Design a protein around this ligand. Structure first.
Ligand SMILES: O=c1ccn([C@@H]2O[C@H](COP(=O)(O)OP(=O)(O)O[C@H]3O[C@H](CO)[C@@H](O)[C@H](O)[C@H]3O)[C@@H](O)[C@H]2O)c(=O)[nH]1
Ligand SMILES: [Mn+2]
Length: 342
């Protein structure tokens, strides 16, 4: 199947860094056509994209008019424009170009050497397991000291939609387009009304990194969190690996058994690196206050979207802490997310 890479651009000429890496690693022009959809009408950015010639297909969002926002959103016009562009660009990919799937990449993302290999290998999983609705290149807790550099091949399922370099099927666009929101499209997909309990595949080591400090949003989130996610640099031949462990029936039995079979250790002991003979442990949280407390104590992202923690799966957040595998998890009686955990 032909899987286009849809690059979303606007007014940053640094889309050059994004395209340079994509084109450098692309293993096949036929299998991975690059379509750059540009919003905004920024001339310099338009010239940069055009300079790539036939290496890419340059399409332009047609409606550059200002958008009438709701009363609570005067400061958020940019988020409305992003949502409009996504609807148009994805519509072009699935309706005009009629591709079966697409990998969405924002102009300020740099891809890893094995970005294409990763999606080539996981497309079949997504196509075969309806409990999955995406494959993302992003590990929300992917800071260098929180990932195992000796396991660049390790993948997980996550209930938290990461975006930032993600694959979706035309089947999903058919589902989302009729109800596409006016703004904040990513947080909208994180709601249960959209997710419907489905997961995404995400890696131990992120296959994308962001360099867009200046953007639509102010920079605190990027400055304190996003900019620290480490880009994988060790090529993993995913298409040669057995990724059957990611199928829901295998994962929910094996990964959960692993998590709850692991010894529980007090957060303070993990933090101070006590009991090092325990290479893999579980730090149990029982409420919203213990979760945020323990998350912050261990350096994990502590915000929640519709009650789901970053990179969480059945409430479990998995990461590395001072060389130890840690599973920040709820009691095994867990049975659903609570959106009131804010
Ligand atoms: O008028 C605009 C402005 C931006 N963009 C594009 O939107 C994307 C995100 O813009 P950016 O300035 O980088 O903002 P972020 O703060 O990074 O936006 C966050 O929130 C967005 C949804 O509101 C998500 O799409 C992003 O992935 C998420 O990082 C990029 O591909 C831009 O080219 C447009 O299409 N039109
Ligand atoms: Mn950005």
């Amino acid at each position: 199947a032909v899987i286009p890479i849809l690059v979303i651009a606007c007014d940053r000429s640094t889309v050059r860094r994004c395209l340079d890496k994509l084109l450098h690693y692309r293993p096949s022009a036929e299998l991975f056509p690059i379509i750059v959809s540009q919003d905004c009408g920024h001339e310099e950015t338009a010239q940069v994209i055009a300079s790539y010639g036939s290496a890419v297909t340059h399409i332009r969002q047609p409606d550059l008019s200002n958008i009438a926002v709701q009363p609570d959103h005067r400061k958020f016009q940019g988020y409305y424009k992003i949502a409009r562009h996504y609807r148009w660009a994805l519509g072009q990919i699935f309706h005009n170009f009629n591709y079966p799937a697409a990998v969405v990449v924002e102009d300020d993302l740099e891809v890893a050497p094995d970005f294409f290999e990763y999606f080539q290998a996981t497309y079949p999983l997504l196509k075969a397991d309806p409990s999955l609705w995406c494959v993302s290149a992003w590990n929300d807790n992917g800071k260098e000291q929180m990932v195992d550099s000796s396991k660049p091949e390790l993948l997980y399922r996550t209930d938290f939609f990461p975006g930032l370099g993600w694959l979706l099927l035309a089947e999903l666009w058919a589902e989302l387009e009729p109800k596409w929101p006016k703004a904040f499209w990513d947080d909208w997909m994180r709601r249960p009304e959209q997710r419907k309990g489905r997961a995404c595949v995400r890696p131990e080591i992120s296959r994308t990194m962001t360099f867009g400090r200046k953007g639509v949003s102010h920079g605190q989130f990027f400055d304190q969190h996003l900019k620290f996610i480490k880009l994988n640099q060790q090529f993993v031949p995913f298409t040669q690996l057995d990724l059957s462990y990611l199928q829901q029936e295998a994962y929910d039995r094996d990964f959960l058994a692993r998590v709850y079979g692991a010894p529980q250790l007090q957060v303070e002991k993990v933090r101070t690196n006590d009991r090092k003979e325990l290479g893999e442990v579980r730090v149990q949280y029982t409420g919203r206050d213990s979760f945020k407390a323990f998350a912050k104590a261990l350096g994990v992202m502590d915000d929640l979207k519709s009650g789901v923690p970053r990179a969480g799966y059945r409430g479990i957040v998995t990461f590395l802490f001072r060389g130890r595998r840690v599973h920040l998890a709820p009691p095994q009686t867990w049975d659903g997310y609570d959106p009131s955990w804010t």
